[PDB]
Amino acid sequence: MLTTLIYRSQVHPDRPPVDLDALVHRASSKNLPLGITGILLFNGLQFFQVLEGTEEALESLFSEIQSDPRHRDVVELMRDYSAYRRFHGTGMRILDLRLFETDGALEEILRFSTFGVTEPVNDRMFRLLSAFIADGGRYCLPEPLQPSRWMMMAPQHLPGQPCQFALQAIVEPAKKRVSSFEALIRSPTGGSPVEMFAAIAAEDRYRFDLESKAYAFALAGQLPLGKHQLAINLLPGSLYHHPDAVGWLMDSLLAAGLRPDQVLIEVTETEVITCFDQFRKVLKALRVAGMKLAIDDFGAGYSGLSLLTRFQPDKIKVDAELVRDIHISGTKQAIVASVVRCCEDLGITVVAEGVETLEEWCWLQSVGIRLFQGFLFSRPCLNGIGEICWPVAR
Amino acid sequence: MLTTLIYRSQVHPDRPPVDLDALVHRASSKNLPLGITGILLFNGLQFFQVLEGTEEALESLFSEIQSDPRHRDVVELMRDYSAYRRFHGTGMRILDLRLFETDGALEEILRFSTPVNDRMFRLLSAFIADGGRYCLPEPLQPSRWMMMPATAAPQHLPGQPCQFALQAIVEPAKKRVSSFEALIRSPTGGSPVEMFAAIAAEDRYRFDLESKAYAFALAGQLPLGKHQLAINLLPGSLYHHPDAVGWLMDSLLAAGLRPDQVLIEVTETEVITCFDQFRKVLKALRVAGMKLAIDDFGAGYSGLSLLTRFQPDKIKVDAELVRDIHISGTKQAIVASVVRCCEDLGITVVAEGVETLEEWCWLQSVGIRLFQGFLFSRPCLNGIGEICWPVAR
Ligand SMILES: Nc1nc2c(ncn2[C@@H]2O[C@@H]3COP(=O)(O)O[C@H]4[C@@H](O)[C@H](n5cnc6c(=O)[nH]c(N)nc65)O[C@@H]4COP(=O)(O)O[C@H]3[C@H]2O)c(=O)[nH]1
Ligand SMILES: Nc1nc2c(ncn2[C@@H]2O[C@@H]3COP(=O)(O)O[C@H]4[C@@H](O)[C@H](n5cnc6c(=O)[nH]c(N)nc65)O[C@@H]4COP(=O)(O)O[C@H]3[C@H]2O)c(=O)[nH]1
Ligand SMILES: Cc1cc2nc3c(=O)[nH]c(=O)nc-3n(C[C@H](O)[C@H](O)[C@H](O)COP(=O)(O)O)c2cc1C
Ligand SMILES: Cc1cc2nc3c(=O)[nH]c(=O)nc-3n(C[C@H](O)[C@H](O)[C@H](O)COP(=O)(O)O)c2cc1C
Ligand SMILES: [Mn+2]
Ligand SMILES: [Mn+2]
Ligand SMILES: [Mn+2]
Ligand SMILES: [Mn+2]
C-alpha cells in the first residue's frame, strides 16, 4: 500500500560535513528499483525528508536511516497511507536550503511536485515542508541538551496501620531543588493503590480514600516538609460524597501541623471531565479554604485545553504517555510544547510525570518543562523521603 | 466571599499621557473603604491590575474600569474565589516596571504583599517577564478595519429529499475563499434538526450518508474549481454500510469532483466515544484520498488525547472559544496554543462562528488565517453566497 513517511534529524556539528552528493546519488539509485520517491532538505544543521513508497519499503528504509551515523535525533513527523505520489522523477531530490532566498526553495519544490487539484497549502506534506523551510530550527535539540553529555549521580514499613504512604519527589534539576512531594497510598503489606482499594468494600472506597489522607498528613508532619508542598490523590467522588470533606481534610491537615496552601489535591481529568456539575462546588470549597488543585494525567484519556475555560487548576501534570518516546515523536513534542506555553500564559505550573531516561528529560527540557516526576530522579519511598539522583555533565 | 480579579489593558499611544499618580491615589482612597485591595503594574504601553474583594464589589468596580476611556483592549486573565488577601492594607498602588532592574519589581511586590506556588504571583511574573506577548498590535485594532461586501443566487432544488446550503471558509489576507462547507437543509429550507426529525431514527445514519450525493451534485455543477468541499457526517453513518467510503468515492466522482477535493467533518465529541471502528474508516478515507477535519474542536473538552492517535488534515476551532476571545485571556491562550501545535503538525486551522471584527482581529493576532462565520459569509441555499472582506483604514 502506498505510504508517506516524513522525518527530521540533525547532523553532528563536531564531525566533518556530510557529503550530500554521495548521499543523494546512492539514495537515488537504491530508491528507484524499490519504487521510493521523495525529497530531502538540508539547512546546514538539520535534514528533513519526505519518503513515498510501499509501507514495507518505507519500513525497511527508515530502519536503515535511523541507524545511520551521519545524523542523530531522528524525529518522525508523519506516517500515513496515501492516494497518490506528490513527488515525481527519480533520484531522490535534494535542496540545500543555505542556497535559497525567501521563497526560492518552495518555488523549486513546486516545479516538479503535484499536490492535487486544490492549493498546495491544503496538503499536510507541503505544510510540513514549508514549516521546516520557514523555521526548521524550532525543534532542533540544543547542544547543551544532548543526552550523551549527561549522566545520573532507610524508612520502615507500618503494617499495623490500615494504609500507609510512599512519598515521591517532584524536582527542578536545573536548580537541584525539590519542588514538592506526592503521597502515594500503599496497602498494609506494601501493595499498590489498586490492591489497597480492592481490599476495601465498594461502598466504603470513597470514605476510605478521604480518610486515608490523615495518615499522609501525619507522615508529612513527622517529616521535615521545609516549606514544601504535599500533593494527595483523591477521587472526585471522595470529596463530593461527604457532608464536608473539605472541612474534614481541613481539620486533619491543621491537626497534623500543615497549612491549607501546603496541600495540593490531585484529580485526573478523566474523572473531572465526567462530572463538572459536582466538581465546581468542591473546587470552590477547596479554593476558599486555601488548598491547591492539580489535574493529574493530563493527556491520558480525554484531555483538553477547553477544560481550562471552565476553571483553571494550580498545576497540570503531563501524563507519562506524552512523555514516553517524546524524543522520536514530533507529535508528542508539539503537543507538550503547546501545553507548556499555554500553562505559562495561564499561570499554571506544569510537571512532566513518568520521566525514566535522560533522553526524555533532555527533550522535555527543550520544550520548556522545568519540573519533573519520575524514577530517573527519585522513586517512591515508603514512609519517608527518598534519595534524589541529579543529572550531571558528561 | 473573597475573590481575586486580574486583567491586563493597553494605553492609547496617540493621546496625552494619563496622570497615573492621580488615578492611583484616587483608586486607593476609594478601594480601601469598600474592602478592595490590589496593585497596578505599568510598562509604558500596558496595565496589569490585580483586584481583591467581594464578588459584588469587584463586579461593580471592574464594570467602571472596563468602560474607562483611559485604556482599551481590557482582557480578563483570572476571576476566582480566594482564601486570603495578598495585598492586605493596600487600596491600590502602582509599580512602573521601567523603574526597576530584573527581579526588582517582584522583590518590591514581596515587601508589601501579605510565592511561585500562587497563580496570581505567576501571572504577575509573566507580565513582568513578557507582558507584551498578547498586546494587540496597532494595525489589528478593530477601529482600523471595516467590512465591505464583495450578489447571492440561492435556489430551491425540487425533487430532492434534502438540500444544502453553502458557507465559505475564507482567507482574508489573500481575499480568497479556501473551501465551502455543505450544510444540510430540509426540502422546505429548514434546519438540519428539522431535516433529520422527518427521518425515522433507525434510518438517520443511512440518510446522512446518502444525502451527500446531493451535496456532491451541487458542488460539481457550480463549478467547484480548485476549492475544497467540506461535508459533515456522523461517524456511525460511515460504519453503517460495508463500503460507505467506496460509495462516497463513486458519488463524488460521478459529480465530477476529485477525492482530495472532498473533506469529511466529524465532531470531536463523536470521534472520542469510539476510537475503535473509526480507525478502519479513516484508513479507507486516506487510501481513497479524501481529507478529514475535526469540527467543533474544543467543545468536547478536546484534543490533546486525539492528536497522538491520529492527526486530521484540519481542525475547526469551536465557536465557544471564538466568542468573547477579545476579552478572555484564557480563550486567547488556548487558541494561540492550538494554532502553534497545528502549525508544528502541519494541520490547517479554521476559526468558526466569527461574528465581529473584534473577534477577527484578536484571532488574527494569535495566528489564525482561515475563518468561517457570518462576518464574512452567511450560508446560501444551493449556491455561493455573498462574501464580505475586512478592509483597512
Ligand atoms: N512507570 C513509571 N511510573 C512512575 C514513574 N514515576 C512515578 N511513577 C508512578 O506513577 C504513579 C503516581 O502517579 P499518579 O498518576 O498519581 O497515579 C496514582 C494515583 O492515581 C493513585 N493513587 C495513589 N494514591 C492514591 C490515593 O490515595 N487515592 C486515590 N484515589 N488514588 C491514589 O494510583 C495511581 C498509580 O499509583 P502508583 O502505583 O503509586 O504509581 C505511582 C508512581 O510510582 C516513572 O518514572 N515510571
Ligand atoms: N451563530 C453563528 N452561527 C454560525 C456562524 N457561522 C456559521 N454558523 C453556523 O454554524 C453551523 C455550521 O457548523 P457545524 O459545526 O458543521 O454544525 C452543523 C453540523 O453539525 C450540522 N450538519 C449540517 N449538515 C449536516 C449533515 O449533512 N449531516 C450531519 N450529520 N450533520 C450536519 O448541523 C449543525 C447545525 O448546522 P447549521 O444550522 O447549518 O448552522 C451552521 C451555521 O449556519 C456564525 O458566525 N455565527
Ligand atoms: C538524511 C538521510 C537521508 C537518507 N535517505 C536515504 C534514501 O532516501 N534512500 C536510501 O537508500 N538511503 C538513504 N539514506 C542512507 C541510509 O541511511 C543508508 O546509509 C543506506 O540506505 C544504506 O544503503 P547501502 O546498502 O547501499 O549502503 C539516508 C541517510 C540520511 C543521513
Ligand atoms: C488602569 C486603570 C485602573 C483603575 N483602577 C481603579 C481602582 O482600582 N479603583 C477605582 O475606584 N477606580 C479605578 N480606575 C478608575 C475607574 O475606571 C473610574 O474612573 C473611577 O473609579 C470612577 O469613580 P470616581 O468618579 O468616584 O473616582 C482605574 C482605571 C484605569 C484606567
Ligand atoms: Mn497523582
Ligand atoms: Mn499521574
Ligand atoms: Mn461542520
Ligand atoms: Mn462546527
A141-394 is a CATH 3.40.30.10 domain: no
Q: Say yes or no for a CB contact (<8 Å) between A339 and B337.
A: yes
How far is the CA of A187 from the CAs of A163, A193, A204, A222, in angstroms? Answer: 5, 7, 15, 20
List the one residue out of A34, A105, A49 whose CA is nearest residue A79: A49
CB contact at 8 A, A380 and A168: yes
| A112 annotated among ligand-binding-site residues | no
Asked if A128 has any chain B CB less than 8 Å from its own CB, the reply is: yes
CB atoms within 10 A of CB B112: 13
Separation between Cα atoms, residue B173 and residue A328, nearest integer Å: 35
Separation between Cα atoms, residue B229 and residue B291, nearest integer Å: 10
Ligand in nearest proximity to the CA of A193: 1
* B133 CB-contact burial (10 Å; exposed 0-12 / middle 13-18 / buried 19+): middle
Those of residues 214-233 in A touching chain B at CB distance below 8 A are 229
Tell me which amino acid residue B220 is.
Answer: G
Grid-cell match 489497597, residue found: A196
Q: Which three cell numbers stand for residue A155?
A: 524508612
CA neighbours closer than 13 Å in the CB half-sphere of residue B275: 9
CA gyration radius, chain B: 26
Distance of CA B306 to the CA centre of its chain: 19
Q: Say yes or no for a CB contact (<8 Å) between B331 and A348.
A: no
CB contact at 8 A, A39 and A7: no
Separation between Cα atoms, residue A262 and residue A254, nearest integer Å: 10
Those of residues 258-277 in A touching chain B at CB distance below 8 A are 260-261, 269, 273
Q: In terms of residues, how long is chain B?
A: 393
Interacting residues of A307 by C-beta distance below 8 A, sequence separation 6+? A269, A272, A273, A295, B301, B302
| B301 conformational bin, left if phi > 0, alpha if psi -120 to 50, beta if neither | left
CB atoms within 10 A of CB B143: 10
Strand pairing class (B262-267; B228-232) = parallel
Q: Which residues of chain B neighbour A261 with C-beta distances below 8 Å?
A: 83, 117
CB atoms within 10 A of CB B67: 8
Separation between Cα atoms, residue A359 and residue B105, nearest integer Å: 37
CATH class for the domain made up of A1-140: alpha beta
Interacting residues of A175 by C-beta distance below 8 A, sequence separation 6+? none
Grid-cell match 526597576, residue found: B100
Strand pairing class (B380-381; B94-96) = unpaired
Nearest to B289 among A84, A121, A287 (CB): A84
Asked if A379 has any chain B CB less than 8 Å from its own CB, the reply is: no
3-state DSSP of chain B? CEEEEEEEEECCCCCCCCCHHHHHHHHHHHHHHHCCEEEEEECCCEEEEEEEEEHHHHHHHHHHHHCCCCCEEEEEEEEEECCCCCCCCCCCCEEEHHHCCCCHHHHHHHHHCCCCCCHHHHHHHHHHHHHHHHCCCHHHCHHHEEEEECCCCCCCCCCCCCEEEEEEEEECCCCEEEEEEEEEECCCCCCHHHHHHCCCHHHHHHHHHHCHHHHHHHHHCCCCCCCEEEEECCHHHHHCCCCHHHHHHHHHHHCCCCHHHEEEEEEHHHHHCCCCCHHHHHHHHHHHCCEEEEEEECCCCCCHHHHCCCCCCEEEECHHHHCCCCCEHHHHHHHHHHHHHHHHHCCEEEEECCCCHHHHHHHHHCCCCEEECCCCCCCEECCCCCCEEEEEC
φ/ψ of residue A116, rounded to 5: 80, -165
Angle, to 10 degrees, between the axis of helix A330-346 and the axis of helix B329-345? 160
Distance from CA of A334 to the nearest CA of B (A): 5
CA dihedral A340, A344, A347, A349 (to 10 degrees): 40
Interacting residues of A60 by C-beta distance below 8 A, sequence separation 6+? none
Distance A296 CA to ligand 5 centre (A): 5
The number of C-beta contacts closer than 8 angstroms across A and B is 192
Separation between Cα atoms, residue A123 and residue B314, nearest integer Å: 10
3-state DSSP of chain A? CEEEEEEEEECCCCCCCCCHHHHHHHHHHHHHHHCCEEEEEECCCEEEEEEEEEHHHHHHHHHHHHCCCCCEEEEEEEEEECCCCCCCCCCCEEEEHHHCCCCHHHHHHHHHCCCCCCCHHHCHHHHHHHHHHHHHHHHCCCHHHCHHHEEECCCCCCCCCCCEEEEEEEEECCCCEEEEEEEEEECCCCCCHHHHHHCCCHHHHHHHHHHCHHHHHHHHHHCCCCCCEEEEECCHHHHHCCCCHHHHHHHHHHHCCCCHHHEEEEEEHHHHHCCHHHHHHHHHHHHHHCCEEEEEEECECCCCCCHHHHCCCCEEEECHHHHCCCCCEHHHHHHHHHHHHHHHHHCCEEEEECCCCHHHHHHHHHCCCCEEECCCCCCCEECCCCCCCCEEEC
Interacting residues of A80 by C-beta distance below 8 A, sequence separation 6+? A3, A4, B286
Separation between Cα atoms, residue A12 and residue A298, nearest integer Å: 35
Asked if B97 has any chain A CB less than 8 Å from its own CB, the reply is: no
The neighbouring-strand residues paired with B80 are B4
Is the CB of A192 within 6 Å of ligand 1? yes
Separation between Cα atoms, residue A15 and residue A306, nearest integer Å: 46
Interacting residues of B102 by C-beta distance below 8 A, sequence separation 6+? none
CB contact at 8 A, A90 and A32: yes
* A238 CB-contact burial (10 Å; exposed 0-12 / middle 13-18 / buried 19+): buried
Interacting residues of B146 by C-beta distance below 8 A, sequence separation 6+? B357, B390, B391, B393
Q: Give me the CATH topology for the region B136-393.
A: TIM Barrel (3.20.20)
Sheet hosting strand A2-10, strand order edge to edge = A72-81, A2-10, A46-54, A37-42, A93-96
Q: Say yes or no for a CB contact (<8 Å) between A138 and B344.
A: yes
| B226 annotated among ligand-binding-site residues | no
Separation between Cα atoms, residue A288 and residue A87, nearest integer Å: 61
Separation between Cα atoms, residue B240 and residue B98, nearest integer Å: 65
Distance from CA of B305 to the nearest CA of A (A): 5
Q: Say yes or no for a CB contact (<8 Å) between A124 and B346.
A: yes
- Match domain B1-135 to its CATH number in 3.90.950.20, 1.25.40.10, 3.40.50.1470, 3.30.70.100: 3.30.70.100
Pocket test for ligand 3, best of A6, A54, A68, A92 (most atoms within 8 A of CB): A68
The neighbouring-strand residues paired with B390 are B147
Q: Say yes or no for a CB contact (<8 Å) between A345 and B81.
A: no
Asked if A325 has any chain B CB less than 8 Å from its own CB, the reply is: no
Distance from CA of B16 to the nearest CA of A (A): 31
Separation between Cα atoms, residue A142 and residue A363, nearest integer Å: 9
CA neighbours closer than 13 Å in the CB half-sphere of residue A341: 21
φ/ψ of residue A228, rounded to 5: -105, 150
Asked if B279 has any chain A CB less than 8 Å from its own CB, the reply is: no
Separation between Cα atoms, residue B51 and residue B359, nearest integer Å: 26
* B151 CB-contact burial (10 Å; exposed 0-12 / middle 13-18 / buried 19+): exposed
φ/ψ of residue A193, rounded to 5: -50, -35
Sheet hosting strand B2-10, strand order edge to edge = B72-81, B2-10, B46-54, B37-42, B94-96
Separation between Cα atoms, residue A321 and residue B308, nearest integer Å: 10
Separation between Cα atoms, residue B198 and residue B186, nearest integer Å: 9
CA neighbours closer than 13 Å in the CB half-sphere of residue B113: 15
Separation between Cα atoms, residue A184 and residue A191, nearest integer Å: 11
CB contact at 8 A, A378 and A357: no
Q: How many degrees, rounded to 5, is the angle at CA A105 between CA A99 and CA A108?
A: 115
Q: In terms of residues, how long is chain A?
A: 394
Q: Which three cell numbers stand for residue A380?
A: 517512591
Distance from CA of A103 to the nearest CA of B (A): 17
CA neighbours closer than 13 Å in the CB half-sphere of residue B134: 34
Domain locations along chain A: 1-140, 141-394
Q: Which three cell numbers stand for residue B316?
A: 475547526
Mutation for A interface: B121, B125, B245, B344, most A CBs within 10 A: B344
Asked if A127 has any chain B CB less than 8 Å from its own CB, the reply is: yes
